[model samples]
Target: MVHYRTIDSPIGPLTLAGHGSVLTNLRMLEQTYEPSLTHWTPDPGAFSGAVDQLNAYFAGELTEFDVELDLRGTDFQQRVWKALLTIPYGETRSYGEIADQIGAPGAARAVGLANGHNPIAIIVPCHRVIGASGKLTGYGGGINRKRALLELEKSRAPADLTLFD
Candidate 1:
């Protein structure tokens, strides 16, 4: 059985789904996903830690996201997702660049396809992948969201933020 919850965020309302502490889905709700949640169970109790981390991220206080995610996809898709994790906050990589990093240099378009199939959103960092020409490309969660995410990261990057401690 799947457990899911919707929570507020700076960009939009986000829906997080998981089972047994392993998060499976975290997409912006009210748009760009399954029209209904009739089959999934609603349990806010499932994500206390995850929600805390997410809230800190929105506040520009957390940079590293270490949530346990069960990314469901093909072998190639999994490889692509893992590489996405390597993309640091406030940085962007092109599809061609991602393909080359994953040892599939000529599969840029295929890389895009795999990216589109990514289930776990922000945690997996699929929004980091962009067009080769350094332009914003298509994002499953919507281009505006993609731009907003990048903007959030860029503005609060550690170098830009002064941490006193």
Candidate 2:
């Protein structure tokens, strides 16, 4: 069974899911994200590590995550997500860069699709992904919330950029 915990943030409520000790998902429950709960199966394992880390992150006390996670996806999607980790907090990367990093130079659209489907939110840093035009693109958490996340990270970043730039 996958265990879960609810966390309140500047954006809204979030549901954090875990299997045993590894965090498996973190999703926004408000706008721009999926509203369906059919896909989730709640478990009872202690997911305090994820909860604590997320709390610290949202509170501007943590910049990077330090807990074990179980992100399940296709091999290509996993590679893309791993590339997302390379993006530092408060910074943003165009979908093209992500595609190149994953050696899928012609798969920017595919990369965007995978990013859109990311079950894990901040931990995967999908908010750090942007458009080639340097504009905020689609975000499961809504552009406003995405802006909030970037702004929060900005305050914690060494050299803050105005907005995920």
lDDT of 1 by residue, 1-165 (tens): 988989998778889997878988888867455854778988868888999999988888888987888888899998999899999888888888899999988888898889877788788898888875766666454778888898899888455445754
Report how far off residue 93 is in candidate 2 (Å).
1.1
Cα lDDT, all candidates: 0.84, 0.78
* Residue 139 Cα positional deviation in candidate 1, in Å, after optimal superposition: 6.8
Q: Give the TM-score of each candidate.
A: 0.89, 0.82
- Model 2 per-residue lDDT tens digits across residues 1-165: 555667787788887777677777788765543444556666544676777777888878788888787778999888988998899877888888898888878888898889877878888899898876766765453777778888888777554576667
Q: Candidate 2: where is the Cα deviation over 4 Å?
A: 31-45, 139-141, 157-165
Give, for candidate 2, the lowest lDDT window spanning 10 residues.
30-39
Error of 2 at 123 (Å): 0.7
| lDDT for residue 81 in candidate 2, whole number 0-100 | 85
